[PDB]
Amino acid sequence: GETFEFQAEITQLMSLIINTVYSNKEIFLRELISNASDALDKIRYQALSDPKQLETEPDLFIRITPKPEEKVLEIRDSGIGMTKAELINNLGTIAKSGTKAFMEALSAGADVSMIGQFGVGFYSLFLVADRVQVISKNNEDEQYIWESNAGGSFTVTLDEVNERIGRGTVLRLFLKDDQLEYLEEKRIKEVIKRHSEFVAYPIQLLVTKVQELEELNKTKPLWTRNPSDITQEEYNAFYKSISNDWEDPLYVKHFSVEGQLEFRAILFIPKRAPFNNIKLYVRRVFITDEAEDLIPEWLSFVKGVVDSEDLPLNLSREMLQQNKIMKVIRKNIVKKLIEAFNEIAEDSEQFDKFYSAFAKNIKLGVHEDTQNRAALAKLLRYNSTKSVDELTSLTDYVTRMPEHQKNIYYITGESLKAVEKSPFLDALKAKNFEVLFLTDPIDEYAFTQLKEFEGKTLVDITKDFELEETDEEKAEREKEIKEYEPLTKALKDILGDQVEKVVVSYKLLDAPAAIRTGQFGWSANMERIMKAQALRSKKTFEISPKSPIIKELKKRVDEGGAQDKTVKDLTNLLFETALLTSGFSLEEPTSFASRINRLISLGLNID
Amino acid sequence: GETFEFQAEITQLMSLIINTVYSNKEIFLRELISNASDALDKIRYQALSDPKQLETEPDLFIRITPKPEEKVLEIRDSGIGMTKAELINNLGTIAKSGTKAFMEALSAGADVSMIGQFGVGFYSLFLVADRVQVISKNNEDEQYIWESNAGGSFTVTLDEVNERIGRGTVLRLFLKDDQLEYLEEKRIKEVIKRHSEFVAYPIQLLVTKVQELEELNKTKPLWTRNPSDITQEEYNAFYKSISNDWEDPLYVKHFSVEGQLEFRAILFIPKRAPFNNIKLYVRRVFITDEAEDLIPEWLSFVKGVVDSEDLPLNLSREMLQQNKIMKVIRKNIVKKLIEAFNEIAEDSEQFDKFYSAFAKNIKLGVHEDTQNRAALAKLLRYNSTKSVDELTSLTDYVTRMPEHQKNIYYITGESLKAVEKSPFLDALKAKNFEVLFLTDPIDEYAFTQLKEFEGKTLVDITKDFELEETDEEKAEREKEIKEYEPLTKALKDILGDQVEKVVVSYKLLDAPAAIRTGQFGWSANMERIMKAQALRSKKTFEISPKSPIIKELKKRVDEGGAQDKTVKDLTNLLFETALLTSGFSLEEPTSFASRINRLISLGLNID
Amino acid sequence: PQNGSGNSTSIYLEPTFNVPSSELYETFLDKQRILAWTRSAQFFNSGPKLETKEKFELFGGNVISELVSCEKDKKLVFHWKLKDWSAPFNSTIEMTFHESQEFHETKLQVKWTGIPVGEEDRVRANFEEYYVRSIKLTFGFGAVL
Amino acid sequence: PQNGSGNSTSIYLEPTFNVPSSELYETFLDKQRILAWTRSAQFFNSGPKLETKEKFELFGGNVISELVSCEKDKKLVFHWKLKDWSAPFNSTIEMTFHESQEFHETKLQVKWTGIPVGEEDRVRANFEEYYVRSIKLTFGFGAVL
Ligand SMILES: Nc1ncnc2c1ncn2[C@@H]1O[C@H](COP(=O)(O)OP(=O)(O)OP(O)(O)=S)[C@@H](O)[C@H]1O
Ligand SMILES: Nc1ncnc2c1ncn2[C@@H]1O[C@H](COP(=O)(O)OP(=O)(O)OP(O)(O)=S)[C@@H](O)[C@H]1O
Ligand SMILES: [K+]
Ligand SMILES: [K+]
Numbered sequence A, B: 001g002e003t004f005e006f007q008a009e010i011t012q013l014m015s016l017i018i019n020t021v022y023s024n025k026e027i028f029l030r031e032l033i034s035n036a037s038d039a040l041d042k043i044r045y046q047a048l049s050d051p052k053q054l055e056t057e058p059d060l061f062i063r064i065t066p067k068p069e070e071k072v073l074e075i076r077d078s079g080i081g082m083t084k085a086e087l088i089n090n091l092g093t094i095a096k097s098g099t100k101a102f103m104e105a106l107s108a109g110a111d112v113s114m115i116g117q118f119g120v121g122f123y124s125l126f127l128v129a130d131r132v133q134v135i136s137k138n139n140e141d142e143q144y145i146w147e148s149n150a151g152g153s154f155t156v157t158l159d160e161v162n163e164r165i166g167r168g169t170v171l172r173l174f175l176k177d178d179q180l181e182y183l184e185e186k187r188i189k190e191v192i193k194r195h196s197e198f199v200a201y202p203i204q205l206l207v208t209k210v211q212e213l214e215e216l217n218k219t220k221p222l223w224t225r226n227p228s229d230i231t232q233e234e235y236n237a238f239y240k241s242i243s244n245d246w247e248d249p250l251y252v253k254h255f256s257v258e259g260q261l262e263f264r265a266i267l268f269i270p271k272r273a274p275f276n277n278i279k280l281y282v283r284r285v286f287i288t289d290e291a292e293d294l295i296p297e298w299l300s301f302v303k304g305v306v307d308s309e310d311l312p313l314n315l316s317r318e319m320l321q322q323n324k325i326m327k328v329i330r331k332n333i334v335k336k337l338i339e340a341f342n343e344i345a346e347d348s349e350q351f352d353k354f355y356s357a358f359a360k361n362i363k364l365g366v367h368e369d370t371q372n373r374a375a376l377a378k379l380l381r382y383n384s385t386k387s388v389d390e391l392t393s394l395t396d397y398v399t400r401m402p403e404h405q406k407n408i409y410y411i412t413g414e415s416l417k418a419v420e421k422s423p424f425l426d427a428l429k430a431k432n433f434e435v436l437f438l439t440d441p442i443d444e445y446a447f448t449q450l451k452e453f454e455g456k457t458l459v460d461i462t463k464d465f466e467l468e469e470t471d472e473e474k475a476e477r478e479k480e481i482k483e484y485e486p487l488t489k490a491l492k493d494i495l496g497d498q499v500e501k502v503v504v505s506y507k508l509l510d511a512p513a514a515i516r517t518g519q520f521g522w523s524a525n526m527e528r529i530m531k532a533q534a535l536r537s538k539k540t541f542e543i544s545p546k547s548p549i550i551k552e553l554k555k556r557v558d559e560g561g562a563q564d565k566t567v568k569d570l571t572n573l574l575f576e577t578a579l580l581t582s583g584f585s586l587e588e589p590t591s592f593a594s595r596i597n598r599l600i601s602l603g604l605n606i607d
Numbered sequence C, D: 001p002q003n004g005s006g007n008s009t010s011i012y013l014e015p016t017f018n019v020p021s022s023e024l025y026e027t028f029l030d031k032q033r034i035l036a037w038t039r040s041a042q043f044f045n046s047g048p049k050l051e052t053k054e055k056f057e058l059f060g061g062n063v064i065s066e067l068v069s070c071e072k073d074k075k076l077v078f079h080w081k082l083k084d085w086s087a088p089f090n091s092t093i094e095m096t097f098h099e100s101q102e103f104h105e106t107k108l109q110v111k112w113t114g115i116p117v118g119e120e121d122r123v124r125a126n127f128e129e130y131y132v133r134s135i136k137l138t139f140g141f142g143a144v145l
């Protein structure tokens, strides 16, 4: 067998890397700024041992000069520069990354991290330009010109016509006739704000007015510092830079993880719900913001950035390959945000503004997420019969629980006024049982999945549920039910199939009758919400044996008026009235209004 | 100036193309099958001129042989094969694509389209394998072995130990110890079902039971044929192959566009709403299904595939670069689907099943889309006072319009029973004006953006709107209003700030009073829907001067009972009763139920 | 080698439904109830419910299921079959009821065997769409969000 | 060269609001109404409404606007300013009312000048969130879906 080294076709590899690698055309600016940043990290590293190399050009900056009169976009940097041998080896060879070679040559204990590791990022500039004119100047060499028209060969010529620069590299990009948009002020600022916003070196842009120098990276990244030394106004300016929001962030959670996977994430909580926002950075370079399994949907209300160095970047640095470390970051983000939510709960003044804007998000997490369902339950705050003045927590609900109460009672509705005076509270108030108030449609969706809190089962009072009772009460209530048995039979066959059964309930002290949904099914509010969604059961008739209306009803039945006209009309009127008090929207509202107009006319002595 | 040809570092280019190009690991199988398909397209092309080249191996197939006892995944193909010179030039050189060179050498008028155009897809197999053993055999050469361990060089040896194959290429992939998942039956079938489902050649998989040959591409793509020759059962099997749905597609729209941009799209309409599905193919090869703006959100209920050849594929063929031709395909998809919707509307029996499942999607398009807002309006079907038996169209609503009606009247509500007997219809029925019935919450969102249909302005009868009237009626109605002016003033200051004004309306013939929302604002149903969303004004009191209740009310006011206890209690009762009839969910239902229990007790002579 | 077909596999799901065992058991047997959450059903027998060893077509005749054995509110075993599948392929699905009186829920542990290897995700994802979410929205046996 | 700042630009939007000109005009002036749809406002004057040449801070003092001229239900001109912007940068926004009685709507043509070049999308996207959708949800001046 004969051995052959692998080869590569150069005339076709250039077309594949330039045209069929990078999706967006504006990515060419991100690679040139990154290369300028890497160059500024080499000369700065040499300044730690020999300051003479830096005194040639002490000002470290990145200057961008658009020229509409010449259709040339110049990008000047004061880095280490490239020698004649480096222009033909590092810049003239595909996949040759001199920046990565400089990283491997660093001493043990260095603190200079660079981005250049592939070696094909320079060729990305030809997406918007036809020919490039790279002007380089190093301390240990002369000033040369690197000119190439994206063909097959490049020309290296001793610079004898351009300006004499001290140190660095100048890149003259002859943009295409159809790519002249990158010479405008708006497009240049857009790419830097998108990809090179947190460069460690000031990026200067020559803006004409009179020509001025515009600093496009005034905001510095805060993930390189400890969260203790960072003040509050610094986090506010950082939030206003990563996001277009105008208000200050309500809360900021800056943590750092080390070990097998290191990443520094600064997560902000806005003041109001924005009804992916987590950006990913790799060494002061924006990668992408389309991470799918990075943060759950119910948690997507927060913003911030995540800087890491172990992310498997692809050739274009526009997306992350399929890996197993993203779910590790996802768990850490959820863990730190839940712990951050507990820190907000420690201050009642701050948690009020947090809950008044992100209540739906917390309740959605209990409905969707299961790993931290019990953890997010500590954040749910609702009103009750004993807390009509403030939003009480589920933990405080257990503290006020008597020794004989073992069920968390709650009630759903459309608003607070519809549940604070509901007749279903008369039974629990007589037994001194606190009942939670639910005013949002998503409240029942959260309790449907929780089902328990600190060993107490969630029980909806609108559903058919039995309450604690003694043998003395059962002996007196059972004999009273059978006396109303002909009445319950009379109320059953009159309504027809509208209800499943007519029973004598003792949980009603003031209302003469009410309607409760069947157990194991949806509630009164749930049926109303499901039928009211723009993108989108069994009832029980209960009567109160202590009200004078029901007492008069059983009298008319015993007289022989089971099919009497007045009894049937009064039963249907009381049935539809109980639907309104229970929260059921009655069908055919004109039949109800017609019966009301009759009683109104009879009240006015109008026959 | 000295000129230097561009070079490439081979030892690093291999690591970049293999590791940092392809996101998913399963993509290695898509490239090998595509290469096998290209090989089967070269020998088949030669069969058109010389059949002797095909008689060596007439059976054209792609055989995949997993071997768990050896950790080797063999992929056999009966293509043209590679000679010794081709294994060292086409397979040994990076970015060298012998398939693309064969395409450029085709004669004028050929009908053989291949996928191989880059020249780096072969190297993708090393993502899951350490060393490869390519066994090739061509007609004009001998059988050789191409072995390479993804290092820096490859070995070419005359095959003298393996089996003697007729013609084609065998690829033995020594998978990694952690990549043994690709040797199972489930993972192999998953990748073919995902990427190589519509290969023009049968893909055989050696499944052990006893070893059998499993055909993984039994379903053939229908976009290569004309839509006329394709029957209905072929479209049903194609829909069940592209999507996991079990039911037959309700409608199929197969069109083809030529010219500056050619693409063949077969779009299916399911039977029910699935509460991106459009796949993109390039020459019988799946590319991606994550198109951002290929189809609007309101139109995402349809499924199907789109085959094109002008898509700017990237190096990994996993996504499409930013371009301007996708919006051209988007307009053609919308145009053809809207025309397809009109074809469904021609058959009343088929449009009933289409509207009963995709009514919300069509109404959402009128609310969201503006370019075809008037076009989608022809598909809206609702009930009316004259169409209580069938869903009438908006076009038929104009045909039944009298010569004096110039406004489309509609009403919103929770269901059909709440709007079919509403008292707001008594005025329009007296004038013989048809009124549309709206039962879905999204109905008002569609009419809020349409605002007009065939020159007729959409008018909601629940809002304050003036109706046609003559000078004779205005002279008799104006003098009657001022007689009820003390009554309207009495009803105003009693309710307080609950209503904005109390006016005497003549649009009520049976109901004594009703509530209508203020103009320019939300309606009664809109306020109920907005407050009932899980993810989330002004009223007018109108009285009827022909009802005996209002006649008795003005009498009590003239007697001196403007602040009488009976009058105030009756006004509040009539006001809340009007809220139920109009569709308003009144607050504090116990205060209403308490007043009903009083009239119930007074009706039973209970003091 | 010889041409044939692949092997079979098995999956296991536990979709929780808020419905008593009496109503949920009759949901998969009452022909009037079946036509509600399926919107397409054709029964061979003219009986009021499903009997033992009774075949019936669902979803436009594409789904072929047969009740081979069933216990009183506790077990439901069907021979599930798809029209796209081959003739020797016959899948068996077992439904076991677990009524929890503490939370008023009901866990329906589904053991589905006989499924082809290339048909795992097709019948599992659709089971949460045509069988789980369909019943939860038609009869209201649980919230969907 | 010298160090300084960039130039300015101008944008034009037409957010349609379902509200009469009377209510919409007073919405941007009534201090009680402004605090509703902004949830944060710092009015320096002790008057019941906004007067000519009156500065007021919005959204936690980050937004600085001043009514320099206003017609009667027809024109609203404000000197909009952001705290993140430089001192010489002062933007001007003009609001014109185009209430229509046939469709029962009102088109508020907004001509916003003086915006920095690197602040176009930041003030345009937020205008549809803090100014357009905020009023449509607080007072109900149009449906949001
Ligand atoms: N502006 C510059 N100043 C100095 N050296 C530069 C400059 N641009 C590029 N280089 C050098 O040229 C080499 C090749 O250029 P690149 O193709 O950008 O390599 P790269 O930056 O490592 O690749 P990526 O895609 O950015 S990881 C770099 O490794 C640097 O050593
Ligand atoms: N199984 C095969 N049988 C015959 N020739 C093959 C086979 N696989 C690869 N080749 C040849 O080897 C060349 C180089 O392989 P590849 O890297 O796959 O090139 P390619 O297929 O054009 O690149 P892409 O990514 O598929 S566009 C191809 O152009 C073919 O001519
Ligand atoms: K290079
Ligand atoms: K190759």
Ligand SMILES: [Mg+2]
Pocket: A030, A031, A032, A034, A035, A116, A121, A122
């Ligand atoms: Mg670079």
Ligand SMILES: [Mg+2]
Pocket: B030, B031, B032, B034, B035, B116, B121, B122
């Ligand atoms: Mg290939």
